[PDB]
Amino acid sequence: SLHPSIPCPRGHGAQKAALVLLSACLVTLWGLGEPPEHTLRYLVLHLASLQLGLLLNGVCSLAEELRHIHSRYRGSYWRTVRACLGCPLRRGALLLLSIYFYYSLPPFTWMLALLGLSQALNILLGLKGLAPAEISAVCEKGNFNVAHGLAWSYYIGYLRLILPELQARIRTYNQHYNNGAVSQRLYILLPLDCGVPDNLSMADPNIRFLDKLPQRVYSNSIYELLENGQRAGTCVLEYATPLQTLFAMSQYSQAGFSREDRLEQAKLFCRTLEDILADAPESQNNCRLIAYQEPFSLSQEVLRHL
């Protein structure tokens, strides 16, 4: 929609693949033709083992979180335990059932010792790490992105404050001038590579500054969208300042912001700004987003958007 390289939200491919895997595995159990009582016993004991492993991982994480009880969790131990071990009730029931089915269904403590050894090794040596796909899925699902805050703050602080006045200001421009008539929209440029030139003339020569939109004060550059050197469109173009912030953050070392992160957060910023402006009451189709990526001329893109 906005751009071919804007990442769409993640689907349920993992669930479908898990379904196919489950079907194949049940088919192959039917192939083995082994007694199912032992199958059920080992499966119950295996989920009990994994519940105890997640319990041990949660206790290890809770060891660290217990020092942050009064900062992130307002000094309540139950919120900390819920944070470190999922839902307390479901995990508590599953773990008590695990203990009972572990003591009942068969040594006894050696299996526990080896499982605890394996999980402590997982934590210490980092075996139980998270792949980049899992991290990205968790971050996007929970809206844990720089881009989300950037776009929401941008819309709330800037676009929400001039768009209600921009149509009236442009009507004032068209009544006080004859020339021609510029669209009521506030066209916004979204370069994916985050590199915004300080002026459109540097960005493109086929785009020429024409006039400053009439008036607090909010400067706006109507641009001569010249096609073959002739005036072919007039629209207000205003820089997307947050996309410059992403470049500045990737420049600074203190930001801890890589260039892969820079590109990804630029893409998510474009996507979430589009989503915000699609349903914003302030936006009444008087705000358009021009998103482009270097492989090309910006001028041709703006003409296509005119």
Ligand X SMILES: CCn1nc(C)cc1C(=O)Nc1nc2cc(C(N)=O)cc(OC)c2n1C/C=C/Cn1c(NC(=O)c2cc(C)nn2CC)nc2cc(C(N)=O)cc(OCCCN3CCOCC3)c21
Contacts of residue 239, Cβ cutoff 8 Å, sequence gap at least 6: 188, 189, 196
For residue 214, the partner it binds in ligand 9IM, ligand X, a copy of itself, none, with Cβ less than 5 to 8 A by kind, is none
> CA 271, CA 294: separation in Å to the nearest integer?
18
Among positions 65, 186, 206, 266, the unique one binding a copy of itself when judged by CB under 8 A: 65
Query: Of ligand 9IM, a copy of itself, ligand X, none, which one does residue 228 interact with (CB within 5 to 8 Å by kind)?
Result: none
By CB under 6 A, tell whether 198 contacts ligand X: no
Find the binding residues for ligand 9IM in span 174-213 (CB under 6 A): none
Instruction: Say if residue 219 carries a ligand binding annotation.
Output: yes
Q: Which stretch binds ligand 9IM (CB under 6 A): 43-51, 126-134, 274-282, 294-302?
A: 43-51
Classify 256 in phi/psi space as left (phi over 0), alpha (psi -120 to 50) or beta: left
CA 213/CA 199 separation, integer angstroms? 16
Least gap, CB of 35 to ligand 9IM (angstroms): 12
111 binds ligand 9IM per the rule CB under 6 A? yes
Residues facing 212 on adjacent strands: 221
Q: How many Cα atoms occupy the beta-carbon half-sphere of 69 within 13 Å?
A: 12
Residue 272 to residue 254: CA distance in whole angstroms? 26
- Cβ neighbors of 235 (< 8 A, separation 6 or more) are 182, 183, 185, 187, 222, 223, 225, 302, 305, 306
Is residue 185 near a copy of itself by the rule CB under 8 A?
Answer: no
Task: Select 76 or 143, whichever has its Cβ closest to ligand X.
Answer: 143
Q: Is 80 annotated as a binding residue?
A: no
Q: Is 303 in the site for ligand 9IM (CB under 6 A)?
A: no
Quote the CA–CA distance of 81 and 98 in Å, as a whole number. Answer: 19
Which 156-195 residues touch ligand X, going by CB under 6 A?
A: 157-158
* 65, 83 contact by CB (below 8 A): yes
Positive or negative, the CA dihedral 6, 12, 14, 16 is negative
Tell me: does residue 67 bind a copy of itself (CB under 8 A).
yes
Question: Minimum CB separation from a copy of itself for residue 53, in Å?
Answer: 9
Q: Which residue is nearest to ligand X (CB)?
A: 157
Instruction: By CB under 6 A, name the binding residues for ligand X.
Output: 150, 153-154, 157-158, 216-220, 241-242, 245
Q: Which residues are annotated as a binding site for 3',3'-c-di-GMP?
A: 153, 158, 216-219, 241
